[PDB]
Structure formats: C-alpha cells, structure tokens
Amino acid sequence: TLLNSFWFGVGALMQQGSELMPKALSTRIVGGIWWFFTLIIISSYTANLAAFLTVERMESPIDSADDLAKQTKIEYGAVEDGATMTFFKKSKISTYDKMWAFMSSRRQSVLVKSNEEGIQRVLTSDYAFLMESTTIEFVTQRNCNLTQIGGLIDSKGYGVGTPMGSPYRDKITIAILQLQEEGKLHMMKEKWWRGNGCPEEESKEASALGVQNIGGIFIVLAAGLVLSVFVAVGEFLYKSKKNAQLEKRSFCSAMVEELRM
Amino acid sequence: LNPLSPDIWMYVLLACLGVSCVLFVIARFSPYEWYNPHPCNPDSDVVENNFTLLNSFWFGVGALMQQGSELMPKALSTRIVGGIWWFFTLIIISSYTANLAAFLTVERMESPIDSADDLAKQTKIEYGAVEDGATMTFFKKSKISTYDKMWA
Amino acid sequence: AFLTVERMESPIDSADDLAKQTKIEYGAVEDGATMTFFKKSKISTYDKMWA
C-alpha cells in the first residue's frame, strides 16, 4: 500500500525494519540502496555527536594560575601602576612569566586605571582579573554575579608608610601588635567586610550528561504519543462513518467485547 | 551506566512503561488490527485480540534494546506509536555510545606525571625539599633552566 | 577519530600563537622599519620572534 511502502520507508531509518521485506527482485534494489542511506547517516550521526561531546571534556577552565596560563580565549589584566605586575614582572617563575609575557604583549587592555575599571571590564566581557585577594571578596559577596577563582599566589601585606629612621615605626608596630592580638582589628574588618548572602557555588550535576542536555527528546515523544490518539479515535469515528450509522452503542458493545477477550 | 545521570535512567524506564501502556490502550481502540486469525477459511466471523498488555509492554521494552520484535503494528494509528518510540530508542543509545567514548578518550589522554620536567610547568601540586639537606643547595646553585626555574 | 581530530585543531590566531609553532615561517620587509621593532623589542615573544 501507499501506507505499507511508506511504513517500510520510515521503519528503516530507525534500525528496526518491518516484516514486509521485498519478496521481488526489481523492488528489492530499492531496499538495498535505501538501507545504505540510513546506515551511513546513523553511523555518521553517532561519531559526529561524539566529536561535539568530546571536545567539551577536552577543556575546562575551572583551575587557575597555571590553567589560566595555558588557554588564550579569556583575556587577562591588572591595574595601571599595579604593584601586582611589578611582582608579576621579573617573576622568574615557571608559569607567571609566561603569563606576564601574554599581558606584556597586549599592554593596552591589560592595564586599567583603577580596580573598578577592571570590575567594569569583567562585567562587560569574559575577562579574568588578577589583583589583591581582599577587595575581590567585596564585589563577589555583594554582587551575586562575579566570583573569585583559584587560591593564594602571593603573601603580601598592607602596611603604613614611613620615612627611614622614623621613631613612629617601632612605636606603631607595637600599637598594631596589641590591636590584632585583641582581635579588635578582626572585629573592625567584620563590620565593613561582613558580606552578603551568596549561592552555595556547588552546582555539580553528578554526571557527564544529564537530563538538561538531551531532555528535549522526552518532549519529542510527548507530542507524538498524544496526537496519535486524537487521530486514533478520529479514524475510529471515520470507521464509525464507514458503516454509515453514527450511533455508537454497537461500538460500545464492541468496546465491551474487547475488554472480555 | 556512568555517562547518563540516574535521572535519565529513571525517566526513561517509566516512559517505556507508560508508552507501553498507551499502546495497549490504543490497541483496544484500533479498528484494522482486528485480524480474524486464520482467515484462510473464514467459517466463523470471530476476531481474537492481539497486542495483549503483556505483548504491548514486551515490544517497547524489547524495541528499546536494539532487536525489534515480531509484533510490528498492522493498523494505521498504532503504527505511529512505535515509529516515534523508535526514534526515541535510536537517539538515546547512539547518545550513550558517544558519551562513553568521550570518557575513554579523556582518560587515554592527559599523560600522568612521570618525570621532574612534568613538575617544571605544573604548579597545582607542590614541589618539596628539606632546606639545607644539600639538595636545595643543588637546585639554587644549578644553572640548567628547568632546575633554575623550579628553584624559583 | 577523523571528525574529532579535525575539530580539535586550531589556527595560528595570534603572534605569540605564531611564536610557538615553528614550521609556519615568519617574515618581514628587510629593514623596512618592521623587524627593526623586533631589533629593540623587549617582549620575550617579540624577542624570540626576532631570533
């Protein structure tokens, strides 16, 4: 039938096939070649999908300070006259000099006048930033859109400036000595550095591929399942027209006979 | 079963359970499939039901796994049910292979550490040395770049 | 393998990206104020460029 030959048509793309195989020769050649269109496509489909879904796990930018040192898609930077790059220059160390060379090259967008400029810049584009690990807290713990990555790279400290041979220094170090040991300095930080609520940052889906990635397929099934029933009763009513008697009671018994057997 | 998350595992099997059920439902509301077994000598105008609830379940669960049953639908409306069901089956398993390949290419790559020069570039895990154990002195005094830079 | 290895290749996007690979050779107009930059260049990539 125009329905049978179409059934074997679609029933062959999917690797099942019906029991309506061509018993005749001239008809058979269609099946031989029709199959060859599928098996190449389906096999082409699988490998290609692996190609998409393998390069994804070939790369992950989660780590930093060497992981960031390897790729180039993400742009790096620091602050104009930033003491960080003064350290980060003449780094003499394994990776950071290689990072420093990268930012040294593009020395027009790496440097920013002040911290907020970079904070603006990361808000704009996919721009990683490298600076002091205290103010990053403020923007990430108050703007729930940015986040610190990596850990510690340097162990500097904020001090107070003073000329050489000033009696204030040792006189004021002891002043700072007792304040910190009193955690008075810690309490003073806790009031301006209290931070706000932030997400748990734990977003692991406990798998490689989950429902989010291919769940659209289940939706595809949902459409076909329901629409068939509408036509299923539709041809049943059309069948209820094929005997020219619109009344359904004989069909109601036909339903009942079906339940019994 | 590592590639797919367990949510798929549950969602699919319940879907297979349901799609088997609805097929059995439509099997009763299927005009053509009534097929008067052995119509060779139609002495008796009797038709026996096919696609029993046991069979209708058996197909989808048997079609999911790549065999295909012998109960291919013989009416119009019931045929669409399987065809959409097939498309679901083909994509999921073909997706299953792709993922499981991705795992084993990731692991086959990435070349675990085997030499000091691997640590030369690496910084995530740490070096280690006892100072003044005459070994640190060797690195600081050395003049080869890999040794020099790891001394830093 | 064909498709996946084909995908993972990348072009020489940047000068430093051109600095690593060596088969793709460099070039400049001789003494046309172009490599003369690379003479007194201070950046390592441009230094290794010039070498």
Curated annotation (Swiss-Prot), chain B:
Residues exposed to the Cytoplasmic side: 28-83
Tissue-wise expression: Highest expression is found in the olfactory lobe, piriform cortex, dentate gyrus, hippocampus, granular cell layer of the cerebellum, and in caudate-putamen.
Subcellular location: Cell membrane; Postsynaptic cell membrane
Positions of transmembrane segments: 7-27, 84-104
PTM: Sumoylation mediates kainate receptor-mediated endocytosis and regulates synaptic transmission. Sumoylation is enhanced by PIAS3 and desumoylated by SENP1. Ubiquitinated. Ubiquitination regulates the GRIK2 levels at the synapse by leading kainate receptor degradation through proteasome.
Chain positions recorded as L-glutamate binding sites: 134-135
Function recorded in the entry: Ionotropic glutamate receptor that functions as a cation-permeable ligand-gated ion channel, gated by L-glutamate and the glutamatergic agonist kainic acid. L-glutamate acts as an excitatory neurotransmitter at many synapses in the central nervous system. Binding of the excitatory neurotransmitter L-glutamate induces a conformation change, leading to the opening of the cation channel, and thereby converts the chemical signal to an electrical impulse. The receptor then desensitizes rapidly and enters a transient inactive state, characterized by the presence of bound agonist. Independent of its ionotropic glutamate receptor activity, acts as a thermoreceptor conferring sensitivity to cold temperatures. Functions in dorsal root ganglion neurons.
Assembly and interaction partners: Homotetramer and heterotetramer with GRIK5. Tetramers may be formed by the dimerization of dimers. Assembles into a kainate-gated homomeric channel that does not bind AMPA. Can form functional heteromeric receptors with GRIK4 and GRIK5. Can form functional heteromeric receptors with GRIK3. Interacts with DLG4. Interacts with NETO2. Interacts (via C-terminus) with KLHL17 (via kelch repeats); the interaction targets GRIK2 for degradation via ubiquitin-proteasome pathway.
Family per similarity comment: Belongs to the glutamate-gated ion channel (TC 1.A.10.1) family. GRIK2 subfamily.
Additional remarks: The postsynaptic actions of Glu are mediated by a variety of receptors that are named according to their selective agonists. This receptor binds domoate > kainate > quisqualate > glutamate. It does not bind AMPA without coexpression with GRIK5.
Record's protein name: Glutamate receptor ionotropic, kainate 2
Species per Swiss-Prot/TrEMBL record: Rattus norvegicus
Organism phylogeny: Eukaryota, Metazoa, Chordata, Craniata, Vertebrata
